Amino acid sequence: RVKRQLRENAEEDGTGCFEIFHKCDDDCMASIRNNTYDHSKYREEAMQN
Amino acid sequence: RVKRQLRENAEEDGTGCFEIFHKCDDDCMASIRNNTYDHSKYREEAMQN
Amino acid sequence: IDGWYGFRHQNAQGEGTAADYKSTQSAIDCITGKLNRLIEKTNQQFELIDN
Amino acid sequence: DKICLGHHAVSNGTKVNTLCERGVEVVNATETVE
Ligand SMILES: *[C@@H]1O[C@H](CO)[C@@H](O)[C@H](O)[C@H]1NC(C)=O
């Protein structure tokens, strides 16, 4: 679920943590935590990184 | 283990064989065999393919 | 040839078969521990009731 | 910018009979045989 919620915005290295390509603050931590995260705001931010 | 060892550098076609974009030599074969491979050195070579 | 598990190998530059012994030997230890658990016979002693 | 997941553990538990391997360390054990 966190894999498909992050999608292309966070390609995971797989050492137990996900690497976010874009900016994800405390509020974005909380949004992923209560599974309301939408990556439509940060898809173009994280695509070119 | 193979999935997050090889990451986006080696994509999947549907047989179990992995389409590594880098020219994986014998040392690369042994390195991905014995859990030594790192994505950071070869993501630049495997990004454009 | 790796046991009751295995990771056979085929390449394009270095063709040949290898074996991922790291997880395989743990798997064989699990199966043989299961085997020694179940094939372990009880300590109950039946007697000759009927003739 | 990273996010991490997992679970917990305890310092001491109890080894429990299991189908696969006898004596697996668990995080908590109860009693079934009084
Ligand atoms: C562990 O299990 C025992 C017995 O059910 C219980 O009394 C105890 O509160 C449990 N402790 C934890 C941390 O779950």
XYZ file of N, CA, C and O and ligand atoms in Angstrom:
746
model
N 0.820 -1.207 0.000
C 0.000 0.000 0.000
C 0.854 1.257 0.000
O 0.545 2.211 -0.719
N 1.945 1.281 0.775
C 2.808 2.461 0.738
C 3.595 2.504 -0.569
O 3.904 3.588 -1.081
N 3.872 1.331 -1.161
C 4.513 1.276 -2.471
C 3.634 1.902 -3.548
O 4.094 2.736 -4.335
N 2.358 1.523 -3.587
C 1.455 2.071 -4.588
C 0.969 3.474 -4.252
O 0.507 4.183 -5.153
N 1.059 3.892 -2.989
C 0.737 5.269 -2.644
C 1.868 6.217 -3.015
O 1.608 7.347 -3.442
N 3.122 5.780 -2.864
C 4.241 6.611 -3.286
C 4.415 6.593 -4.800
O 4.697 7.638 -5.399
N 4.248 5.420 -5.420
C 4.264 5.192 -6.880
C 5.634 5.602 -7.421
O 6.656 5.219 -6.832
N 5.708 6.365 -8.514
C 6.984 6.737 -9.112
C 7.682 7.858 -8.348
O 8.870 8.104 -8.583
N 6.977 8.521 -7.425
C 7.569 9.615 -6.660
C 8.658 9.148 -5.703
O 9.497 9.960 -5.297
N 8.666 7.869 -5.333
C 9.649 7.345 -4.386
C 10.048 5.942 -4.831
O 9.354 4.967 -4.531
N 11.167 5.847 -5.545
C 11.751 4.555 -5.879
C 12.517 4.042 -4.667
O 13.445 4.702 -4.187
N 12.132 2.870 -4.172
C 12.638 2.387 -2.894
C 13.931 1.601 -3.076
O 14.020 0.718 -3.932
N 14.936 1.930 -2.259
C 16.174 1.156 -2.252
C 15.995 -0.186 -1.555
O 16.693 -1.151 -1.885
N 15.080 -0.268 -0.596
C 14.715 -1.531 0.006
C 15.508 -1.967 1.216
O 15.534 -3.168 1.508
N 16.155 -1.045 1.927
C 16.846 -1.365 3.169
C 15.964 -1.140 4.392
O 16.479 -0.914 5.494
N 14.645 -1.212 4.223
C 13.702 -0.945 5.285
C 13.072 0.427 5.242
O 12.179 0.705 6.052
N 13.504 1.294 4.329
C 12.989 2.649 4.229
C 12.805 3.006 2.762
O 13.419 2.408 1.876
N 11.946 3.990 2.511
C 11.686 4.493 1.171
C 12.405 5.822 0.981
O 12.425 6.660 1.887
N 12.992 6.013 -0.199
C 13.676 7.259 -0.536
C 12.723 8.157 -1.318
O 12.357 7.844 -2.454
N 12.331 9.275 -0.715
C 11.446 10.233 -1.369
C 12.278 11.128 -2.280
O 13.239 11.765 -1.834
N 11.909 11.176 -3.562
C 12.629 12.027 -4.504
C 12.253 13.494 -4.323
O 13.085 14.384 -4.531
N 11.007 13.765 -3.940
C 10.518 15.122 -3.767
C 10.583 15.519 -2.291
O 11.139 14.803 -1.453
N 10.010 16.675 -1.961
C 9.978 17.147 -0.583
C 8.746 16.603 0.131
O 7.630 16.672 -0.390
N 8.959 16.064 1.330
C 7.892 15.467 2.135
C 8.158 15.862 3.585
O 9.049 15.305 4.231
N 7.393 16.831 4.081
C 7.618 17.401 5.405
C 6.874 16.575 6.456
O 6.489 15.428 6.218
N 6.706 17.152 7.652
C 5.990 16.478 8.733
C 4.522 16.258 8.380
O 3.948 15.210 8.703
N 3.904 17.238 7.717
C 2.526 17.084 7.266
C 2.408 15.985 6.216
O 1.402 15.272 6.168
N 3.428 15.827 5.370
C 3.372 14.792 4.342
C 3.649 13.408 4.940
O 3.070 12.407 4.491
N 4.522 13.339 5.966
C 4.592 12.166 6.847
C 3.225 11.792 7.403
O 2.823 10.624 7.345
N 2.499 12.772 7.947
C 1.193 12.493 8.538
C 0.182 12.059 7.482
O -0.661 11.192 7.743
N 0.261 12.648 6.284
C -0.659 12.305 5.204
C -0.432 10.884 4.702
O -1.395 10.175 4.388
N 0.830 10.456 4.601
C 1.097 9.056 4.274
C 0.681 8.152 5.435
O 0.204 7.027 5.225
N 0.826 8.641 6.674
C 0.483 7.848 7.854
C -1.008 7.536 7.926
O -1.394 6.404 8.240
N -1.866 8.521 7.642
C -3.304 8.267 7.632
C -3.856 8.069 6.224
O -4.963 8.546 5.936
N -3.054 7.457 5.338
C -3.286 7.016 3.953
C -4.198 7.928 3.133
O -5.049 7.456 2.373
N -4.010 9.239 3.277
C -4.688 10.235 2.460
C -3.730 10.943 1.513
O -4.069 12.005 0.979
N -2.543 10.383 1.300
C -1.538 11.030 0.469
C -1.900 10.918 -1.006
O -2.249 9.838 -1.494
N -1.813 12.040 -1.713
C -1.961 12.081 -3.161
C -0.677 12.642 -3.748
O -0.233 13.728 -3.356
N -0.085 11.908 -4.682
C 1.183 12.287 -5.290
C 1.012 13.155 -6.527
O 1.993 13.386 -7.242
N -0.208 13.621 -6.810
C -0.445 14.465 -7.975
C 0.187 15.843 -7.835
O 0.462 16.490 -8.851
N 0.414 16.308 -6.606
C 1.078 17.590 -6.405
C 2.583 17.498 -6.621
O 3.203 18.477 -7.056
N 3.187 16.343 -6.339
C 4.639 16.210 -6.333
C 5.167 15.247 -7.391
O 6.362 14.922 -7.363
N 4.312 14.770 -8.305
C 4.760 13.840 -9.340
C 5.788 14.477 -10.271
O 6.830 13.880 -10.561
N 5.522 15.699 -10.737
C 6.484 16.376 -11.597
C 7.695 16.871 -10.819
O 8.768 17.039 -11.407
N 7.540 17.114 -9.515
C 8.684 17.450 -8.675
C 9.632 16.265 -8.535
O 10.857 16.435 -8.561
N 9.085 15.061 -8.387
C 9.892 13.873 -8.151
C 10.268 13.122 -9.422
O 11.091 12.202 -9.351
N 9.688 13.475 -10.571
C 9.991 12.752 -11.802
C 11.387 13.080 -12.316
O 12.135 12.184 -12.725
N 11.757 14.358 -12.304
C 13.032 14.787 -12.863
C 14.200 14.616 -11.902
O 15.351 14.788 -12.317
N 13.940 14.281 -10.643
C 15.007 14.094 -9.667
C 15.633 12.710 -9.793
O 15.156 11.869 -10.554
N 14.647 -9.925 -2.714
C 16.051 -9.562 -2.532
C 16.672 -9.138 -3.853
O 17.365 -8.119 -3.930
N 16.407 -9.907 -4.915
C 16.874 -9.544 -6.251
C 16.205 -8.257 -6.733
O 16.847 -7.422 -7.385
N 14.932 -8.055 -6.367
C 14.173 -6.874 -6.783
C 14.793 -5.585 -6.264
O 15.083 -4.670 -7.044
N 15.031 -5.497 -4.959
C 15.681 -4.288 -4.464
C 17.203 -4.351 -4.453
O 17.836 -3.383 -4.020
N 17.816 -5.440 -4.917
C 19.230 -5.362 -5.263
C 19.414 -4.728 -6.636
O 20.317 -3.908 -6.840
N 18.549 -5.079 -7.593
C 18.755 -4.630 -8.965
C 18.051 -3.310 -9.259
O 18.516 -2.557 -10.124
N 16.936 -3.033 -8.582
C 16.206 -1.752 -8.595
C 15.686 -1.498 -10.021
O 15.309 -2.440 -10.732
N 15.659 -0.236 -10.460
C 15.116 0.104 -11.772
C 16.135 -0.182 -12.874
O 15.788 -0.213 -14.062
N 17.396 -0.418 -12.490
C 18.465 -0.708 -13.444
C 18.197 -1.985 -14.232
O 18.472 -2.060 -15.434
N 17.653 -3.002 -13.567
C 17.225 -4.230 -14.225
C 15.704 -4.309 -14.163
O 15.123 -4.403 -13.078
N 15.068 -4.264 -15.328
C 13.624 -4.378 -15.433
C 13.224 -5.831 -15.679
O 14.052 -6.688 -15.988
N 11.930 -6.103 -15.532
C 11.395 -7.453 -15.629
C 10.582 -7.614 -16.904
O 9.736 -6.773 -17.226
N 10.838 -8.706 -17.624
C 10.131 -8.999 -18.864
C 9.037 -10.044 -18.701
O 8.074 -10.037 -19.476
N 9.153 -10.938 -17.723
C 8.110 -11.916 -17.490
C 8.537 -13.366 -17.580
O 7.724 -14.236 -17.909
N 9.805 -13.645 -17.290
C 10.322 -15.005 -17.371
C 11.093 -15.327 -16.098
O 11.304 -16.496 -15.754
N 11.477 -14.289 -15.363
C 12.417 -14.404 -14.269
C 13.794 -13.896 -14.617
O 14.612 -13.693 -13.711
N 14.076 -13.688 -15.900
C 15.304 -13.045 -16.334
C 15.168 -11.535 -16.193
O 14.082 -10.977 -16.382
N 16.271 -10.877 -15.852
C 16.267 -9.457 -15.527
C 17.033 -8.688 -16.593
O 18.205 -8.980 -16.856
N 16.369 -7.700 -17.195
C 16.947 -6.908 -18.280
C 17.755 -5.764 -17.675
O 17.299 -4.625 -17.562
N 18.986 -6.087 -17.277
C 19.878 -5.073 -16.725
C 20.378 -4.171 -17.846
O 20.867 -4.640 -18.883
N 20.217 -2.860 -17.658
C 20.604 -1.909 -18.695
C 22.116 -1.750 -18.767
O 22.660 -1.485 -19.844
N 22.803 -1.904 -17.638
C 24.256 -1.962 -17.640
C 24.702 -3.301 -18.222
O 24.032 -4.324 -18.064
N 25.841 -3.288 -18.910
C 26.488 -4.515 -19.352
C 27.061 -5.251 -18.147
O 28.181 -4.971 -17.710
N 26.287 -6.185 -17.598
C 26.653 -6.901 -16.377
C 27.687 -7.968 -16.715
O 27.366 -8.999 -17.308
N 28.935 -7.727 -16.319
C 30.026 -8.658 -16.581
C 30.043 -9.750 -15.509
O 29.084 -9.929 -14.754
N 31.140 -10.510 -15.448
C 31.242 -11.607 -14.488
C 31.372 -11.091 -13.059
O 30.810 -11.681 -12.126
N 32.110 -9.994 -12.869
C 32.206 -9.374 -11.552
C 30.863 -8.805 -11.113
O 30.498 -8.904 -9.936
N 30.112 -8.217 -12.051
C 28.753 -7.763 -11.766
C 27.841 -8.932 -11.407
O 26.985 -8.813 -10.518
N 28.019 -10.068 -12.089
C 27.232 -11.266 -11.813
C 27.497 -11.779 -10.403
O 26.563 -12.075 -9.646
N 28.775 -11.856 -10.024
C 29.134 -12.289 -8.677
C 28.663 -11.291 -7.625
O 28.221 -11.690 -6.540
N 28.737 -9.991 -7.936
C 28.337 -8.954 -6.988
C 26.837 -8.979 -6.723
O 26.406 -8.836 -5.572
N 26.022 -9.159 -7.767
C 24.590 -9.314 -7.537
C 24.244 -10.692 -6.992
O 23.141 -10.878 -6.463
N 25.154 -11.660 -7.103
C 24.934 -12.954 -6.470
C 25.128 -12.889 -4.957
O 24.315 -13.434 -4.201
N 26.186 -12.222 -4.489
C 26.584 -12.322 -3.087
C 26.190 -11.102 -2.250
O 26.816 -10.851 -1.212
N 25.172 -10.349 -2.688
C 24.595 -9.207 -1.963
C 25.641 -8.120 -1.692
O 25.961 -7.795 -0.547
N 26.172 -7.559 -2.777
C 27.260 -6.593 -2.679
C 26.931 -5.403 -3.582
O 27.457 -4.298 -3.402
N 25.984 -5.612 -4.498
C 25.682 -4.644 -5.545
C 25.061 -3.370 -4.982
O 24.210 -3.410 -4.090
N 25.496 -2.234 -5.520
C 24.995 -0.923 -5.133
C 24.449 -0.219 -6.365
O 25.067 -0.256 -7.435
N 23.289 0.422 -6.208
C 22.630 1.091 -7.324
C 23.283 2.416 -7.689
O 23.092 2.891 -8.814
N 24.022 3.033 -6.763
C 24.460 4.415 -6.951
C 25.562 4.535 -7.995
O 25.657 5.561 -8.677
N 26.404 3.510 -8.132
C 27.501 3.583 -9.090
C 27.009 3.412 -10.523
O 27.593 3.986 -11.451
N 25.934 2.655 -10.726
C 25.516 2.257 -12.063
C 24.151 2.798 -12.469
O 23.695 2.505 -13.583
N 23.488 3.582 -11.613
C 22.221 4.191 -12.008
C 22.408 5.248 -13.090
O 21.489 5.482 -13.883
N 23.581 5.883 -13.147
C 23.852 6.846 -14.209
C 23.975 6.155 -15.561
O 23.515 6.684 -16.579
N 24.592 4.973 -15.589
C 24.700 4.217 -16.830
C 23.382 3.554 -17.211
O 23.072 3.441 -18.402
N 22.592 3.128 -16.229
C 21.345 2.428 -16.506
C 20.133 3.348 -16.584
O 19.024 2.863 -16.821
N 20.307 4.656 -16.385
C 19.164 5.561 -16.400
C 18.649 5.819 -17.813
O 17.436 5.792 -18.048
N 19.552 6.051 -18.768
C 19.142 6.494 -20.095
C 18.623 5.363 -20.973
O 17.996 5.638 -22.003
N 18.862 4.111 -20.602
C 18.439 2.986 -21.427
C 17.029 2.535 -21.065
O 16.069 2.848 -21.768
N 22.528 -28.721 -8.503
C 22.797 -29.567 -7.345
C 22.926 -28.636 -6.146
O 24.004 -28.089 -5.886
N 21.825 -28.432 -5.427
C 21.849 -27.631 -4.208
C 21.064 -28.232 -3.054
O 21.177 -27.724 -1.934
N 20.274 -29.282 -3.271
C 19.490 -29.884 -2.211
C 18.007 -29.901 -2.521
O 17.610 -30.018 -3.683
N 17.180 -29.772 -1.487
C 15.726 -29.675 -1.617
C 15.280 -28.227 -1.743
O 14.261 -27.822 -1.175
N 16.034 -27.464 -2.531
C 15.886 -26.053 -2.862
C 17.055 -25.748 -3.788
O 18.029 -26.505 -3.848
N 16.954 -24.644 -4.516
C 18.095 -24.223 -5.296
C 17.870 -23.003 -6.156
O 16.733 -22.636 -6.463
N 18.971 -22.372 -6.559
C 18.961 -21.173 -7.392
C 19.906 -21.450 -8.558
O 21.097 -21.133 -8.495
N 19.378 -22.062 -9.613
C 20.179 -22.337 -10.794
C 20.384 -21.054 -11.590
O 19.612 -20.096 -11.479
N 21.450 -21.033 -12.381
C 21.918 -19.813 -13.010
C 22.111 -20.009 -14.507
O 22.539 -21.073 -14.963
N 21.776 -18.968 -15.264
C 22.067 -18.910 -16.689
C 22.344 -17.462 -17.055
O 21.593 -16.565 -16.660
N 23.413 -17.241 -17.807
C 23.922 -15.912 -18.106
C 23.883 -15.675 -19.614
O 23.272 -16.434 -20.371
N 24.516 -14.584 -20.041
C 24.748 -14.322 -21.454
C 26.214 -14.071 -21.770
O 26.588 -14.091 -22.947
N 27.051 -13.838 -20.759
C 28.475 -13.595 -20.955
C 29.291 -14.583 -20.131
O 30.446 -14.880 -20.456
N 28.689 -15.086 -19.057
C 29.360 -15.936 -18.095
C 28.581 -17.199 -17.797
O 28.427 -17.560 -16.624
N 28.048 -17.832 -18.848
C 27.070 -18.916 -18.744
C 27.572 -20.082 -17.903
O 28.675 -20.594 -18.116
N 26.747 -20.487 -16.944
C 27.076 -21.531 -15.998
C 26.100 -21.513 -14.841
O 25.383 -20.525 -14.652
N 26.063 -22.583 -14.056
C 25.106 -22.717 -12.968
C 25.797 -22.462 -11.635
O 26.884 -22.989 -11.382
N 25.164 -21.653 -10.794
C 25.635 -21.361 -9.448
C 24.609 -21.877 -8.439
O 23.647 -22.563 -8.795
N 24.826 -21.546 -7.169
C 23.945 -22.007 -6.100
C 23.951 -20.982 -4.980
O 25.017 -20.639 -4.461
N 22.765 -20.495 -4.609
C 22.630 -19.542 -3.505
C 22.493 -20.333 -2.207
O 21.398 -20.653 -1.744
N 23.648 -20.632 -1.608
C 23.700 -21.528 -0.455
C 23.160 -20.868 0.809
O 22.758 -21.573 1.745
N 23.119 -19.531 0.836
C 22.818 -18.768 2.048
C 21.411 -19.039 2.570
O 21.222 -19.365 3.747
N 20.409 -18.915 1.705
C 19.044 -19.237 2.092
C 18.728 -20.717 1.932
O 17.864 -21.236 2.654
N 19.429 -21.398 1.020
C 19.167 -22.810 0.762
C 19.497 -23.664 1.976
O 18.703 -24.523 2.366
N 20.657 -23.426 2.599
C 21.060 -24.243 3.741
C 20.156 -24.004 4.945
O 19.859 -24.940 5.698
N 19.684 -22.766 5.121
C 18.694 -22.487 6.157
C 17.383 -23.216 5.880
O 16.739 -23.728 6.805
N 16.983 -23.286 4.604
C 15.778 -24.031 4.243
C 15.928 -25.523 4.526
O 15.004 -26.155 5.049
N 17.090 -26.096 4.193
C 17.336 -27.514 4.465
C 17.377 -27.780 5.962
O 16.894 -28.816 6.429
N 17.938 -26.848 6.737
C 17.915 -26.989 8.189
C 16.491 -26.941 8.727
O 16.149 -27.685 9.652
N 15.634 -26.104 8.131
C 14.229 -26.062 8.535
C 13.505 -27.372 8.219
O 12.779 -27.907 9.068
N 13.709 -27.908 7.011
C 13.054 -29.162 6.624
C 13.573 -30.335 7.450
O 12.794 -31.190 7.887
N 14.881 -30.386 7.705
C 15.418 -31.489 8.492
C 15.055 -31.362 9.966
O 14.903 -32.380 10.648
N 14.889 -30.137 10.471
C 14.377 -29.971 11.822
C 12.929 -30.404 11.947
O 12.543 -31.017 12.946
N 12.114 -30.100 10.930
C 10.748 -30.617 10.865
C 10.737 -32.141 10.827
O 9.923 -32.791 11.502
N 11.643 -32.717 10.034
C 11.755 -34.165 9.907
C 12.128 -34.802 11.241
O 11.503 -35.772 11.674
N 13.122 -34.237 11.928
C 13.524 -34.773 13.224
C 12.474 -34.516 14.297
O 12.431 -35.239 15.297
N 11.637 -33.492 14.120
C 10.534 -33.270 15.046
C 9.460 -34.340 14.892
O 8.986 -34.907 15.883
N 9.065 -34.633 13.653
C 7.918 -35.514 13.455
C 8.317 -36.983 13.555
O 7.622 -37.784 14.190
N 9.447 -37.349 12.944
C 9.967 -38.713 13.002
C 10.425 -39.088 14.419
O 10.584 -40.276 14.727
N 10.593 -38.101 15.307
C 10.719 -38.356 16.741
C 9.503 -39.113 17.260
O 8.377 -38.603 17.234
N 9.725 -40.345 17.700
C 8.654 -41.215 18.153
C 8.425 -41.007 19.649
O 9.343 -40.656 20.394
N 7.182 -41.222 20.075
C 6.766 -40.941 21.441
C 7.396 -41.918 22.433
O 7.995 -42.930 22.068
N 7.252 -41.593 23.714
C 7.778 -42.418 24.791
C 6.715 -43.304 25.424
O 6.976 -43.922 26.461
N 5.525 -43.378 24.832
C 4.443 -44.151 25.426
C 4.679 -45.636 25.210
O 5.156 -46.055 24.152
N 4.334 -46.429 26.212
C 4.583 -47.865 26.205
C 3.237 -48.581 26.209
O 2.575 -48.669 27.244
N 2.830 -49.092 25.049
C 1.646 -49.934 24.987
C 1.926 -51.296 25.620
O 3.070 -51.742 25.736
N 0.855 -51.958 26.042
C 0.945 -53.278 26.638
C 0.085 -54.243 25.839
O -0.638 -53.855 24.920
N 0.167 -55.518 26.202
C -0.580 -56.564 25.510
C -1.903 -56.749 26.242
O -1.992 -57.503 27.213
N -2.935 -56.043 25.785
C -4.248 -56.147 26.416
C -4.978 -57.391 25.932
O -5.428 -58.221 26.730
N -5.104 -57.533 24.620
C -5.808 -58.656 24.026
C -4.827 -59.801 23.791
O -3.613 -59.610 23.716
N -5.374 -61.005 23.672
C -4.601 -62.221 23.481
C -4.998 -62.873 22.165
O -6.185 -62.913 21.824
N 14.639 13.474 3.306
C 13.313 13.074 2.853
C 13.223 11.560 2.681
O 13.463 11.035 1.594
N 12.877 10.863 3.761
C 12.721 9.416 3.718
C 11.687 8.999 4.755
O 11.379 9.744 5.688
N 11.141 7.799 4.568
C 10.086 7.262 5.418
C 10.400 5.800 5.721
O 10.768 5.039 4.819
N 10.278 5.414 6.993
C 10.700 4.102 7.465
C 9.561 3.390 8.182
O 8.724 4.029 8.827
N 9.546 2.062 8.077
C 8.509 1.212 8.647
C 9.146 0.047 9.397
O 10.361 -0.163 9.340
N 8.317 -0.710 10.107
C 8.817 -1.893 10.785
C 7.859 -2.423 11.828
O 6.638 -2.357 11.673
N 8.443 -2.972 12.891
C 7.714 -3.558 14.010
C 8.593 -3.445 15.251
O 9.573 -2.697 15.267
N 8.237 -4.191 16.295
C 8.949 -4.081 17.561
C 9.569 -5.421 17.955
O 9.552 -6.392 17.194
N 10.110 -5.475 19.172
C 10.637 -6.695 19.771
C 10.691 -6.494 21.280
O 10.373 -5.419 21.793
N 11.094 -7.548 21.990
C 11.354 -7.470 23.420
C 12.743 -8.024 23.701
O 13.353 -8.702 22.869
N 13.247 -7.711 24.896
C 14.554 -8.211 25.303
C 14.515 -9.708 25.588
O 15.437 -10.441 25.213
N 13.460 -10.181 26.247
C 13.321 -11.593 26.581
C 11.906 -12.058 26.276
O 10.937 -11.349 26.566
N 11.797 -13.250 25.696
C 10.514 -13.876 25.444
C 10.503 -15.319 25.902
O 10.996 -15.633 26.989
N 9.937 -16.210 25.088
C 9.923 -17.633 25.399
C 9.974 -18.416 24.094
O 9.266 -18.087 23.139
N 10.825 -19.439 24.055
C 10.908 -20.335 22.912
C 9.677 -21.236 22.882
O 9.308 -21.826 23.904
N 9.048 -21.334 21.714
C 7.732 -21.944 21.554
C 7.829 -23.053 20.512
O 8.537 -22.908 19.509
N 7.151 -24.174 20.775
C 7.009 -25.233 19.780
C 6.282 -24.718 18.543
O 5.281 -24.004 18.647
N 6.790 -25.086 17.373
C 6.306 -24.577 16.101
C 6.304 -25.754 15.128
O 7.004 -26.745 15.345
N 5.463 -25.668 14.087
C 5.441 -26.684 13.039
C 6.801 -26.833 12.369
O 7.265 -27.954 12.130
N 7.462 -25.716 12.072
C 8.694 -25.744 11.294
C 9.918 -26.035 12.159
O 10.615 -27.031 11.943
N 10.190 -25.177 13.139
C 11.394 -25.272 13.950
C 11.029 -25.156 15.420
O 10.404 -24.174 15.827
N 11.431 -26.147 16.213
C 11.128 -26.130 17.638
C 11.979 -25.087 18.352
O 13.204 -25.060 18.202
N 11.327 -24.225 19.130
C 12.032 -23.261 19.950
C 12.223 -21.902 19.310
O 13.328 -21.351 19.333
N 11.160 -21.345 18.739
C 11.233 -20.034 18.110
C 11.003 -18.965 19.171
O 10.041 -19.038 19.944
N 11.900 -17.980 19.226
C 11.746 -16.864 20.150
C 10.577 -15.987 19.720
O 10.524 -15.521 18.577
N 9.638 -15.763 20.635
C 8.437 -14.989 20.353
C 8.418 -13.768 21.262
O 9.169 -13.672 22.231
N 7.541 -12.819 20.931
C 7.522 -11.569 21.681
C 6.715 -11.721 22.970
O 6.978 -11.018 23.951
N 5.760 -12.651 23.010
C 5.016 -12.944 24.226
C 4.431 -14.341 24.122
O 4.020 -14.777 23.045
N 4.376 -15.031 25.258
C 3.842 -16.381 25.310
C 2.902 -16.515 26.494
O 3.155 -15.976 27.573
N 1.816 -17.247 26.282
C 0.875 -17.588 27.333
C 1.038 -19.061 27.677
O 1.928 -19.744 27.167
N 0.170 -19.554 28.549
C 0.149 -20.957 28.918
C -1.102 -21.612 28.353
O -2.165 -20.989 28.298
N -0.961 -22.856 27.888
C -2.104 -23.680 27.523
C -2.282 -24.901 28.411
O -3.398 -25.418 28.492
N -1.232 -25.358 29.082
C -1.300 -26.519 29.961
C -1.130 -26.021 31.387
O -0.029 -25.616 31.781
N -2.205 -26.065 32.166
C -2.156 -25.549 33.526
C -1.348 -26.479 34.423
O -1.551 -27.696 34.420
C 2.036 -11.071 27.643
O 1.086 -12.124 27.909
C 0.699 -12.228 29.288
C -0.208 -13.432 29.396
O -1.315 -13.326 28.513
C 0.026 -10.932 29.729
O -0.301 -11.020 31.112
C 0.956 -9.749 29.486
O 0.283 -8.532 29.786
C 1.430 -9.720 28.031
N 2.387 -8.645 27.831
C 2.483 -7.954 26.690
C 3.526 -6.880 26.657
O 1.763 -8.192 25.725
